Amino acid sequence: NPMRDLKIEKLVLNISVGESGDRLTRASKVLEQLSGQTPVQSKARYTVRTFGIRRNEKIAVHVTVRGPKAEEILERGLKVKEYQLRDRNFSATGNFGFGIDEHIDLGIKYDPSIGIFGMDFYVVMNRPGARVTRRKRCKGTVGNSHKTTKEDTVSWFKQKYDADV
Amino acid sequence: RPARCYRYQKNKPYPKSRYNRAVPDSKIRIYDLGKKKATVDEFPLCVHLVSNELEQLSSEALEAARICANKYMTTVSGRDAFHLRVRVHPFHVLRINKMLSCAGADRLQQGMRGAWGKPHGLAARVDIGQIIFSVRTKDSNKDVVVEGLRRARYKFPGQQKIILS
Amino acid sequence: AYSSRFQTPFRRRREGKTDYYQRKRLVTQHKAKYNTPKYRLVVRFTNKDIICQIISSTITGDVVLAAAYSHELPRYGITHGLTNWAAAYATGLLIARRTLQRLGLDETYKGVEEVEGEYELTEAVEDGPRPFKVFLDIGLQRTTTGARVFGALKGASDGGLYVPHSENRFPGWDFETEEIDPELLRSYIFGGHVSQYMEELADDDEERFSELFKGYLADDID
Amino acid sequence: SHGYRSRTRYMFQRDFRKHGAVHLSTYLKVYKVGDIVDIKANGSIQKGMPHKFYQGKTGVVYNVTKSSVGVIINKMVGNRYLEKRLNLRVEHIKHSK
RNA sequence: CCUGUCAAACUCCAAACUUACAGACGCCGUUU
RNA sequence: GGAUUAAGUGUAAUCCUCUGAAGGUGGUCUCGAGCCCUAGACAGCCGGGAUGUUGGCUUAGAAGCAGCCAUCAUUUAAAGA
RNA sequence: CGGCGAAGAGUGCAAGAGCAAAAGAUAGCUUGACAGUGUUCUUCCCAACGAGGAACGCUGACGCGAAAGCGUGGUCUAGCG
RNA sequence: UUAGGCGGCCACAGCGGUGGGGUUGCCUCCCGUACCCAUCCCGAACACGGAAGAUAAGCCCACCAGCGUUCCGGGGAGUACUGGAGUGCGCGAGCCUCUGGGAAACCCGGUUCGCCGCCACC
């Protein structure tokens, strides 16, 4: 029972692409004093016409979560811009964060996404034992039974703090 | 023309697009005739087109001998009956005397080694008994299609057997 | 299976047990009580349990002369969690002084010893204690710094068996300390990590385990 | 071009099922003195390799030099002398029928 | 999903056959 | 002993060398396949090839027989729009 | 940030071959790209012929490793007089 | 080994799927970072320390054949091809006979959901 219940594992915020803290190391400042940690990431994909053609990229991305830091964040997080907080918005797996997608090559990849819900929010929902699949060892796979359902997912969060819409 | 030192296999492989360029395009219209899609296979009446010989008809050979074939298949009211199939493709490339390789007969030139014949044409080859190009429908008439191939054969270097359904 | 077009590599493979391309690694250094098809001072980890084995391979076999596995400890010694390093120093230390010299330890067998002047007598070994040996292979596992795997090695080192390994790729002590730093030689167990979690608010007792080790080095039963 | 890996193509190559590293046992096995051993090159080897020509014929092992065993085709080359130069590892197979 | 074809520089397959070594029979050699 | 061939085909193993490829023959012999026959075939052979009506439409015409639609009825021994 | 994902993203350079607790990546350390002298194969199938090359030793001195061990340049076959 | 470790052959072992098993003996999942050690950031992993709790994963045991693979019966097929011989046929391309070998595709039916070695072990 309690096992079946859905809770949020790692969320992680993120930022847009391009260089960050261009004038001075900034934009990391936001994400700072927000969420508590300070991630930074880099990128690949050299020739960008209006992007850089830098290889190793300063590119801003970051955040993550845990338990309880993203609660008390993802608190006063959701209840931010959500014209349609949920619906079609997230999908089979449980949760999402998106907006309007573009015709781009997708699907055959690990599936990180451009998608921007908020400063592209990533609530990811998983119930269960699930640490099973992720963890290195006999990985195991999710049952596709005890898997999240969007319906269940658009529950839990909604029951608390904010309407589904 | 004429096709003489063309369709007798006294050579070995390739086609190989890697190796060769400047191949002439085939002048053999589509190898899918009649109504495709629906399985023509449900039909009374059967097939034809047996080579009864060795090989290498050129695209010049098949493309006016096959639509020539189709032309008197038109009798069955344009789009109403049979599907025509062609089998083999003209892959196989041939080269002709470009005076630089060897001497004497073709695939030999001048000097020793050197110009292999320059690309000029392609022809599919066939065996003693293969079906050059078949398909039928119910006995539309006595066998218009059988009449077809009468004309179809008579522009092949080989002596083709009608072969009964 | 498949179309069988592919050939599958498995043996031990398929579901994992041994590795290969390791465990081949071990073996070349002929170690074990005697020549071994595969020899080790295996260290395995389990939730709530640590196991130490030790033994040369057989065609079919992969026997083990003497084993540890905190679990049995406390035969004597004490009830505490077994899923910590301390209590994974004890074993791998208790195995030593079992495998390490009891049934037999490093290459010691009846008859003339392997070619080379080598004689082993009770008490400190003559012509060097150097000959005692085993290689310890963590099975599939990850080498870390002070990790229990290594720790298993630390005792079951000063247990008489001499295994190669690299110092500074151990816990130091503290997590598993020596009673006195001036003398390396001593049986030493510590569980500082957890200890000082609280200061000494209550609960954990590092003090108990030094107790265990005391017993270990000595004339004990099995 | 010209070199050790000359036209080989299949003879050297080992395919699909047996790819990757090979078992240690073969290259560890010892032979002593006149023992007839076949010669080949198991692919997936990168040392203790003989030429390419002369692979397939048996030779008699003789003493070992360095970590490699004198063997090779001690046996005759063509209808000819047992002129032999052997520098083969146990990696290439031994045994007799 | 059904359906139509290929390869000197393709291969999940795969001969006949050529070939190293050995034993056997044959043949040969120890006044040739 | 037996059968085929009527073209002097042929009397030409192989081949620079012996051509012949995708003209004709109810001369004759042999072999096979389809259909029709004693409810009588072929000749099979011999003789004959109904009225409304040129059916309606279409068309310059469209009279059984370019094409479309219909394909009835009568007189019959019999004869389809 | 999460999920899917045996490999479609490597190894200086042709082609073919080798490689996954690696020969690939990352990090650290290090100078064996060492001196001397051989055995063998190759060059040149068989079958003699130089330079060159390679495989595998030993002697001496080092490097790294817990150790077995690896290192006689760059996974192998071109880069030479 | 009523669950382990190291392997050999390297799909008959692959892919997919059903059922069963332990809780203190095992393997894990699991719990937790003082230490040795670790993440270009994360005790995720690696490493160490440990047993509150589970069999749900893994694993082990029994089993299913739909796909892939192996082998076999029957059919295809003594066909395709072929080593040796021929004052056998054919204008020729080529075919035939005798002798010695002998396939592939595919179809239908079985087989295969690993076998084996050493060691340790209620």
From Swiss-Prot, chain A:
> InterPro entries given for it?
Ribosomal_uL5 (IPR002132), Ribosomal_uL5_C (IPR031309), Ribosomal_uL5_CS (IPR020929), Ribosomal_uL5_dom_sf (IPR022803), Ribosomal_uL5_N (IPR031310)
Q: Which GO terms describe its molecular function?
A: RNA binding; rRNA binding; structural constituent of ribosome
Per the record, the domain of life is Eukaryota
The entry's keywords: Acetylation, Cytoplasm, Methylation, Nucleus, Ribonucleoprotein, Ribosomal protein, RNA-binding, rRNA-binding
Q: List the subcellular locations.
A: Cytoplasm; Nucleus
Q: What is its main location?
A: cytoplasm
Keyword Secreted assigned:
no
**PTM annotation, UniProt:** N-terminally acetylated by acetyltransferase NatA.
Query: Where are the N6,N6,N6-trimethyllysine residues found in this chain?
Result: K69
One GO-annotated biological process of the protein:
cytoplasmic translation
Q: Does the keyword Oxidoreductase apply?
A: no
Q: Which GO terms describe its cellular component?
A: cytosol; cytosolic large ribosomal subunit; nucleus
Q: Which family does it belong to?
A: Belongs to the universal ribosomal protein uL5 family.
- Quote the record's miscellaneous comment: Present with 39000 molecules/cell in log phase SD medium. There are 2 genes for uL5 in yeast.
Q: How does it assemble?
A: Component of the large ribosomal subunit (LSU). Mature yeast ribosomes consist of a small (40S) and a large (60S) subunit. The 40S small subunit contains 1 molecule of ribosomal RNA (18S rRNA) and 33 different proteins (encoded by 57 genes). The large 60S subunit contains 3 rRNA molecules (25S, 5.8S and 5S rRNA) and 46 different proteins (encoded by 81 genes). Component of a hexameric 5S RNP precursor complex, composed of 5S RNA, RRS1, RPF2, RPL5, RPL11A/RPL11B and SYO1; this complex acts as a precursor for ribosome assembly.
Name under which the protein is recorded: Large ribosomal subunit protein uL5A
UniProtKB/Swiss-Prot annotation, chain B:
Q: Which UniProt keywords apply?
A: Cytoplasm, Isopeptide bond, Phosphoprotein, Repeat, Ribonucleoprotein, Ribosomal protein, Ubl conjugation
Q: Which GO terms describe its cellular component?
A: cytoplasm; cytosol; cytosolic large ribosomal subunit
Predominant location category: cytoplasm
GO BP terms: namely: cytoplasmic translation; ribosomal large subunit assembly; translation; translational termination
Q: Which GO terms describe its molecular function?
A: structural constituent of ribosome
| Superkingdom of origin organism | Eukaryota
Positions modified as Phosphoserine? S140
Please state where this protein is localized: Cytoplasm
Q: Which family does the record claim for this protein? A: Belongs to the universal ribosomal protein uL16 family.
Query: What does the subunit comment say?
Result: Component of the large ribosomal subunit (LSU). Mature yeast ribosomes consist of a small (40S) and a large (60S) subunit. The 40S small subunit contains 1 molecule of ribosomal RNA (18S rRNA) and 33 different proteins (encoded by 57 genes). The large 60S subunit contains 3 rRNA molecules (25S, 5.8S and 5S rRNA) and 46 different proteins (encoded by 81 genes).
Described by its record, this protein's role is as follows:
Component of the ribosome, a large ribonucleoprotein complex responsible for the synthesis of proteins in the cell. The small ribosomal subunit (SSU) binds messenger RNAs (mRNAs) and translates the encoded message by selecting cognate aminoacyl-transfer RNA (tRNA) molecules. The large subunit (LSU) contains the ribosomal catalytic site termed the peptidyl transferase center (PTC), which catalyzes the formation of peptide bonds, thereby polymerizing the amino acids delivered by tRNAs into a polypeptide chain.
From Swiss-Prot, chain C:
What does the UniProt entry say about where the protein is found?
Answer: Cytoplasm; Nucleus
Query: Keywords, A to Z?
Result: Cytoplasm, Isopeptide bond, Nucleus, Phosphoprotein, Ribonucleoprotein, Ribosomal protein, RNA-binding, rRNA-binding, Ubl conjugation
PTM Phosphoserine: list the residues: S157, S166
Chief location? cytoplasm
Select a single GO molecular function from the record's annotations and give it.
Answer: 5S rRNA binding
Q: Which GO terms describe its cellular component?
A: cytoplasm; cytosol; cytosolic large ribosomal subunit; nucleus
Cross-link type Glycyl lysine isopeptide (Lys-Gly) (interchain with G-Cter in ubiquitin), placed at K154
Which regions form coiled coils?
none
Instruction: Tell me one GO biological process term.
Output: ribosomal large subunit assembly
**Record function comment:** Component of the ribosome, a large ribonucleoprotein complex responsible for the synthesis of proteins in the cell. The small ribosomal subunit (SSU) binds messenger RNAs (mRNAs) and translates the encoded message by selecting cognate aminoacyl-transfer RNA (tRNA) molecules. The large subunit (LSU) contains the ribosomal catalytic site termed the peptidyl transferase center (PTC), which catalyzes the formation of peptide bonds, thereby polymerizing the amino acids delivered by tRNAs into a polypeptide chain.
Q: Which family does it belong to?
A: Belongs to the universal ribosomal protein uL18 family.
Protein name from the UniProt record:
Large ribosomal subunit protein uL18
**What is the organism of origin for this protein?**
Saccharomyces cerevisiae (strain ATCC 204508 / S288c) (Baker's yeast)
From Swiss-Prot, chain D:
- Would I find RNA-binding among this entry's keywords? no
Keywords of the record, alphabetical order, are: Cytoplasm, Isopeptide bond, Ribonucleoprotein, Ribosomal protein, Ubl conjugation
What subcellular compartments does it reside in? Cytoplasm
| Primary location group | cytoplasm
Organism's domain of life? Eukaryota
Annotated crosslink Glycyl lysine isopeptide (Lys-Gly) (interchain with G-Cter in ubiquitin) location: K29
Q: What are the GO BP annotations of this UniProt entry?
A: cytoplasmic translation
Q: Name one GO cellular component term.
A: cytosol
Q: Which GO terms describe its molecular function?
A: structural constituent of ribosome
Family of the protein in this entry: Belongs to the eukaryotic ribosomal protein eL21 family.
Q: Assembly and partners? A: Component of the large ribosomal subunit (LSU). Mature yeast ribosomes consist of a small (40S) and a large (60S) subunit. The 40S small subunit contains 1 molecule of ribosomal RNA (18S rRNA) and 33 different proteins (encoded by 57 genes). The large 60S subunit contains 3 rRNA molecules (25S, 5.8S and 5S rRNA) and 46 different proteins (encoded by 81 genes).
Additional detail: There are 2 genes for eL21 in yeast.
> Could you tell me what this protein does?
Component of the ribosome, a large ribonucleoprotein complex responsible for the synthesis of proteins in the cell. The small ribosomal subunit (SSU) binds messenger RNAs (mRNAs) and translates the encoded message by selecting cognate aminoacyl-transfer RNA (tRNA) molecules. The large subunit (LSU) contains the ribosomal catalytic site termed the peptidyl transferase center (PTC), which catalyzes the formation of peptide bonds, thereby polymerizing the amino acids delivered by tRNAs into a polypeptide chain.
Protein name listed in UniProt: Large ribosomal subunit protein eL21A
Q: Which residues of the full protein are shown?
A: 4 to 100 of 160
